[PDB]
Design a protein around this nucleic acid. Structure first.
Lengths: 79, 144, 206, 96, 98, 114, 127
RNA sequence: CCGGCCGGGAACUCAAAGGAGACUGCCAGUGAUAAACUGGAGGAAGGUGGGGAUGACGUCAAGUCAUCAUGGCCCUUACGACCAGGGCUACACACGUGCUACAAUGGCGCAUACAAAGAGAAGCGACCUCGCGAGAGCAAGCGGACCUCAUAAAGUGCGUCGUAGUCCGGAUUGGAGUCUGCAACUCGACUCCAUGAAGUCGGAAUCGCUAGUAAUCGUGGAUCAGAAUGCCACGGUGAAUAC
């Protein structure tokens, strides 16, 4: 995969997740940051991930954790 | 060949028997510029040919190749025409080598040793190629 | 499109280079771009002066620009304030202490930069091209010039299709590599668009 | 090639030698086998154009992105034009 | 002892320059080895010659860097005083490293 | 010769007849014969029974036939039940590892339809 | 005494030294059957010495570098025939006639632009 | 200290500058006693020696207004500008050009020999230690015929495999990682373990090559932080055939 040293999330998503788990899961999060590895504290939140045009809501299950965000937001619509 | 009549280049003879005939035979057998491999195959195959027939090396080769040399070869006419000697033994070697590549034995030295042995009593595949050429030039004899 | 540039195939044979500095890979691009700036500036600010060549050389952290021109007096001026002004701004551009020299191109009708600039100037003063070309070939063949070919091209006389119409007199041996062919090229921005003027001048066989 | 792009290129160089080569120190020294804190991996809120892997190496004269040649600093087109005129020293046709 | 290594793009210009530095040095000082030539670096550049498609039309170019090495042996004060400020070369890079 | 399952390989060198076990290639087989102290080029004929169940004892220490097939199947099911890119991609029957589907996706996608 | 030949062949160079003596061949401080005499055609370094024979005639200390197997071997052949200024210009009648004093000036042809190699043009489609 | 390693030698390879050399020059024959052709000697080379650069007047109103320049037209709170995410990587399909194969003239393991040409400072990065490996750590030397990339590989000598979809082939896929880079999900490269398709020589048809050529084997470079089976170069082995 990547990275022997740390996983990756953006610092703005770090702060939005800390405030999102502190004051309870109230609303989906506008996230453009698809670069970001799902952390175990993010479990239960609804984080909408940008797929180029739309923020699609991603409910975090326990087995999302070894993954990037953008895996759960497909960008190309094939029929 | 449109204009240019040509010479020909001189090949080095064989490093074991001094035979330019057999040197051209290892060049006919050679693939991908690998000459060492081809001369190993020729030395092994003709060595077991000399051991099997008991004659000698290149007279067993010269008999086995003497049985496959074509005599003559072929609106659309298929005229019969007399083969030049250099082309004669060139075709001989090409048919021996090609028929030896067709065979289903283990090693190339056994395929070619068995093909030269099958050509010593003229019953192999290259003799069927020679008889085939001679049926074509014998059927169409009416054009000279 | 098929002929080699007749300066470039003669670069080691008879023609010299217009830049004659050595530089390693660290400063080759920087020296080269600094040369584009000093030839760009020094070409724009001497448009009236009939400049032929500008030769750069860099002896040990200092530029040495040589202006081959046909009118050296207008480059120097009344006591050479224009020269010291030019080396001041060339020292501004290149960032090194600048020297500057002026080489007088006598016989200016045998220099292809001056001929192409002449015909270009006449074409953008709206004169007919056959006079400009034909006069250029006649007065160039008049003084030496074992051959000359001029070639204008492109929407000539304000047409709606583009022609070429080249002329030549004498011998212009362009595949011969020891031929001293002085070739240069200009563009005439007229009110109908660009008109390309090429001119080859054969001077001698070695 | 689109003035905007050349200006954008100068922006990226100026940020590249302002921040990084001074705080790219971080990514060379602290992301290392030393302790750890997650902190300096998150201290890449530097303006993303300080990264020197965002310069394109455009042509010095025309700003063309493709066909660049690092020795001369120019695209292949201006290398040929200038090479033939004789402003590139030493450079001439090759044949062997 | 004192190696002077000269580089230039023009071989006439570099052997002129090194002939001048040789006769300067062994005229004033002593014990100059000689202009050893040290292989020419040929850097080749293969550009596309057209402003659009047409890969197969290319133009090949080269820059030949010539070296010469001198290697002056005797460290006379006269040859290092007389060796400085006297080049009269324009396209030569010298390296006068001891 | 019935090692690690119903697998019965024979009349072949032991480095290579062990590769018949689903979950051992060449490397892992060199590890089994080195760990069991067996020469690499003996057959299963000409090999004792105590020697065979030392090979059983060694091949039991890696995840092989059944456990490996259901482990792989479990991995693929986890992906397809996540509905990630690798799962949708794994589900439609199109190449996973970011390859070219405009042409030449043909192992993964099967021989061409019309 | 000591007799020299330069002897090169496709990017090789074989210094050939000859003293009169036995029939030994010393190539890069190594024997003939150990340098390339485990390989194809060690006969060609011995071809100049079958025109009048080497049986116990001359020890030759040869030193070749550059090139391949056959390149080095052809270089030694040319080197010995250049180094048979031991005897006079007598030999160079017959040694000329075997085609041995000819420097075989076949070199690898350069790759040319738009061709995959020196002449193999890339294949062209429909028409 | 057996290594050009040292003192040393400048012979030799070589390096690079300057010269000599090949011109039908000599001989014989044929030919309008002409041009020339055929053959021979000498010579490293023999008849534009090999290769390259060099591409006439013009043709295709061929290609490029997106390298650049440019006439006219058009947008000028937008057809200009800044940003994040996406796309250019989509896939029922069809075509082009390549790579790897289908194997025994081979696969694998062990040992061992012979290159040329290049690149390198925000770079090439030894030695040594750790890791199965990609790599990591400390870090000399080198702006370079001095150091590094960098071990050439086919070859050869042994052993094994034994005509099997096999010890062929490596696609695909799961897992585990390394590096570069703010960041490898869309969408890198490489490594390790596992998986092990299709393919057994290709229908009609079609292409390249005339000699260091084709074929085959490796190596380097440009672009480039990282990304070539492409491109541009370099050498190794080395044919067949031309009535």
């Amino acid at each position: 995969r990547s990275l022997k040293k740390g996983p990756f999330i953006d610092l703005h998503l770090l702060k939005k997740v800390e405030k999102a788990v502190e004051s309870g899961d109230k609303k989906p999060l506008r996230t453009w940051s698809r670069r970001s590895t799902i952390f175990p504290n993010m479990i239960g939140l609804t984080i909408a991930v940008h797929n180029g045009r739309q923020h699609v809501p991603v409910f975090v299950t326990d087995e999302m954790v070894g993954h990037k965000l953008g895996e759960f937001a497909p960008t190309r619509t094939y029929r | 060949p449109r204009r240019r009549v040509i010479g020909q280049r001189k090949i080095l003879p064989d490093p074991k028997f001094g035979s330019e005939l057999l040197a051209k035979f290892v060049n006919i057998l050679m693939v991908d510029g690998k000459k060492s491999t081809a001369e190993s195959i020729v030395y092994s195959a003709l060595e077991t040919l000399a051991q099997r027939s008991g004659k000698s090396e290149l007279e067993a080769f010269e008999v086995a190749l003497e049985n496959v040399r074509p005599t003559v070869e072929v609106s659309t006419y298929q005229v019969p025409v007399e083969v030049r000697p250099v082309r004669r033994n060139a075709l001989a070697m090409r048919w021996i080598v090609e028929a030896a590549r067709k065979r289903g034995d283990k090693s190339m030295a056994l395929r070619l040793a068995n093909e030269l042995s099958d050509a010593a009593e003229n019953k192999g595949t290259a003799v069927k190629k020679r008889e085939d050429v001679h049926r074509m030039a014998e059927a169409n004899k009416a054009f000279a | 499109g098929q002929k080699v540039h007749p300066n470039g195939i003669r670069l080691g044979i008879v023609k010299p280079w217009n830049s004659t500095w050595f530089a390693n890979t660290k400063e080759f691009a920087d020296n080269l771009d600094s040369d584009f700036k000093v030839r760009q500036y020094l070409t724009k600010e001497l448009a009236k002066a009939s400049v032929s060549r500008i030769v750069i050389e860099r002896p040990a952290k200092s530029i040495r620009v040589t202006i081959h021109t046909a009118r050296p007096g207008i480059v120097i001026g009344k006591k050479g304030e224009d020269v010291e002004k030019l080396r001041k701004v060339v020292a501004d551009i290149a960032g090194v202490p600048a020297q500057i020299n002026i080489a007088e191109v006598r016989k200016p009708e045998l220099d292809a930069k001056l001929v192409a600039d002449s015909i270009t100037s006449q074409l953008e003063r709206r004169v007919m091209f056959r006079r400009a070309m034909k006069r250029a070939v006649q007065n160039a063949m008049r003084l030496g010039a074992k051959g000359i070919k001029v070639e204008v091209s492109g929407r000539l006389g304000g047409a709606e299709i583009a022609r070429t119409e080249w002329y030549r007199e004498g011998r212009v041996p362009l595949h011969t590599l020891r031929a001293d062919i002085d070739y240069n090229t200009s563009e005439a921005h007229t009110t109908y668009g660009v008109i390309g003027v090429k001119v080859w001048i054969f001077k001698g066989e070695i | 090639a689109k003035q905007s792009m050349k200006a954008r290129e100068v922006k990226r160089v100026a940020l590249a030698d302002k921040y990084f080569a001074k705080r790219a120190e971080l990514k060379a020294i602290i992301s290392d086998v030393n302790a750890r804190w997650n902190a300096v991996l998150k201290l890449q809120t530097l303006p993303r154009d300080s990264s020197p892997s965002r310069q394109r190496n455009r042509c010095r004269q025309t700003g063309r992105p493709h066909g660049f040649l690092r020795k001369f600093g120019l695209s292949r087109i201006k290398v040929r034009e200038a090479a033939m005129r004789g402003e590139i020293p030493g450079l001439k046709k090759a044949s062997w | 002892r004192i190696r002077i290594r000269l580089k230039a793009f023009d071989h006439r210009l570099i052997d002129q320059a090194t002939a001048e530095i040789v006769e300067t040095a062994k005229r004033t000082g002593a014990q100059v080895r000689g202009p050893i030539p040290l292989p020419t670096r040929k850097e080749r550049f293969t550009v596309l010659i057209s402003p659009h498609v047409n890969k197969d039309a290319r133009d090949q170019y080269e820059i030949r860097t010539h070296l010469r090495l001198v290697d002056i042996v005797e460290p006379t004060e006269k040859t290092v005083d007389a060796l400085m400020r006297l080049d009269l070369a324009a396209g030569v890079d010298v390296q006068i490293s001891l | 010769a019935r090692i690690a399952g119903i697998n019965i390989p024979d009349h072949k060198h032991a480095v290579i007849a062990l590769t018949s076990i689903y979950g051992v290639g060449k490397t892992r087989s060199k590890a089994i014969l080195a760990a069991a102290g067996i020469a690499e080029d003996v057959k299963i004929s000409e090999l004792s029974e105590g020697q065979i169940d030392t090979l059983r004892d060694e091949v039991a220490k890696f995840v092989v036939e059944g456990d490996l097939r259901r482990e792989i199947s479990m991995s693929i099911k986890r992906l397809m039940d996540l509905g990630c890119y690798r799962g949708l991609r794994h589900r439609r029957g199109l190449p996973v590892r970011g390859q070219r589907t405009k042409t030449n996706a043909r192992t993964r996608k099967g021989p061409r339809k019309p | 005494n000591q007799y020299y030949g330069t002897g090169r062949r496709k990017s090789s160079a074989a210094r050939v030294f000859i003293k009169p003596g036995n029939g030994k061949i010393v190539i890069n401080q190594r024997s003939l059957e150990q340098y390339f005499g485990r390989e194809t055609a060690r006969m060609v370094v011995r071809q100049p010495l079958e025109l009048v024979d080497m049986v116990e005639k001359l020890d030759l200390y040869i030193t070749v570098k550059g090139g391949g197997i056959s390149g080095q071997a052809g270089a030694i052949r040319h080197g010995i025939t250049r180094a048979l200024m031991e005897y006079d210009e007598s030999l160079r009648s017959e040694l000329r006639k075997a085609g041995f004093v000819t420097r075989d000036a076949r070199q690898v042809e350069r790759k040319k632009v738009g061709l995959r190699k020196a002449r193999r043009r890339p294949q062209f489609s429909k028409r």
